Design a protein around this ligand. Structure first.
Ligand SMILES: C=C(c1ccc(OC)cc1)c1ccc(S[C@@H]2O[C@H](CO)[C@H](O)[C@H](O)[C@H]2O)cc1
Ligand SMILES: C=C(c1ccc(OC)cc1)c1ccc(S[C@@H]2O[C@H](CO)[C@H](O)[C@H](O)[C@H]2O)cc1
Ligand SMILES: [Ca+2]
Ligand SMILES: [Ca+2]
Ligand SMILES: [Ca+2]
Ligand SMILES: [Ca+2]
Lengths: 121, 121, 121, 121
């Protein structure tokens, strides 16, 4: 399993030691408080009131937790994924990323604490 | 495993089919949007800005997800618990409850979607 | 003319030196930031999102500026009134009041700066 | 005297019938709700939580009411000005403007109701 922190201001994302392989079932739990710039903070589902101004992930709110698996596009994580299997041919290290507009990560604040494990399969 | 919804306006809480026994390891993932009265909604960590005016759980914000195990006191869940073991002698059905002040659940709105499973042990 | 400060925690209200007499025309300008309890602050129009939970003035938002003129009920002031005449039979000293629920003024803070003058008539 | 509406999406501003002449004393009262983009609305003091990202007036919040008088730079109005005199060499038609970032007025909404009069002098 992996446990660690993902900073909201980390545009490249936080690489984990989890390599997602074909058939793996994973569970992710995310917690904490972060901002994409405002003095307010939001949890891992982000800000449901804020429009999408060009986010790295269009299927999650600004300020949500998302991930990439190897060379994949972004995949929503939000609060977490329960005994999840990847629906397509994605493989490789999981990187956790804060959902914001590229180039705008420098004013971000806070972090999420994340746990990832592989479940029985 | 159990998957279901917990309404924010449900003062008694949502009973699950998970019976927590000694030594069990459980994982919980919670998602969604709810309110303790305001037109705004918050995720399963609740409203970090709102004071505790007498909540059922003093160790989580107003609007957070909490639980009881059998006859226990409230236990914070928030976004979830990863491969969690109960630290004391608690046993029995898990009930999920929205964290609000007793008697004030009638103006609540929304719900959380929750998954609970027992992990390998 | 009168200028002074209306404290949000002043339940009885701020008496002014203005005695409203029949036929008088008055102008009020109010400015500043105050709270009825929450960490946020609002201007003299108060909080348009907050329901009326027993306000002293049901025709203005919580945290708005209101007034009484001698024997009157509360009258909304908000940001002010321009060359305003009172209703029939309304006369006497103007008192300015923060619009909130009686008995809850103890957790209020901030204040409004207010000017009142009598206009030509 | 002048009364009218200042649209938040009106980048050039709302011209008034008031010509500010040397030695004039004026009173302005402004009221209402507007937005510079977000779902929320703010009064004529604007949004005290939002940083200045290139406002036309750096001495008022985003979403505040401001003015120009003939050749002047922007001057804060907020909720209004009581028996106010202009700085040296400031004269001409008063234009009222919603304080926002140039080129972003297209996603604004709402308006302020404004009265201006000349006072005795
Ligand atoms: C004036 C304040 C307030 C806020 C903060 C304060 O101290 C920081 C003091 C007073 C205020 C405003 C709105 C609500 S909603 C309010 O929340 C309650 C729990 O706390 C109940 O769920 C109730 O059903 C709900 O309507 C509750 C309190
Ligand atoms: C005027 C509006 C706005 C809001 C809603 C709108 O449509 C509903 C239009 C404009 C506004 C206000 C604050 C921010 S913070 C803003 O968010 C960005 C992502 O969207 C970046 O993370 C940036 O670093 C941050 O400062 C962004 C936009
Ligand atoms: Ca940002
Ligand atoms: Ca409630
Ligand atoms: Ca109060
Ligand atoms: Ca704008």
């Amino acid at each position: 399993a992996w446990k660690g922190e993902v900073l909201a201001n980390n545009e490249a994302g936080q690489v984990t030691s989890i390599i997602y392989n074909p058939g793996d079932v994973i569970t992710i739990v995310a917690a904490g408080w972060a901002s994409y710039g405002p003095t307010q903070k939001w949890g891992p589902q982000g800000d449901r009131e804020h429009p999408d101004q060009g986010l790295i992930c269009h299927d999650a709110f600004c300020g949500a937790l998302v991930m990439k698996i190897g060379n994949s596009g972004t995949i929503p994580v939000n609060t977490g994924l329960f005994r999840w299997v990847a629906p397509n041919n994605v493989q490789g290290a999981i990187t956790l990323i804060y959902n914001d507009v590229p180039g705008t990560y420098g004013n971000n604040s806070g972090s999420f604490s994340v746990n990832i494990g592989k479940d029985q399969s």
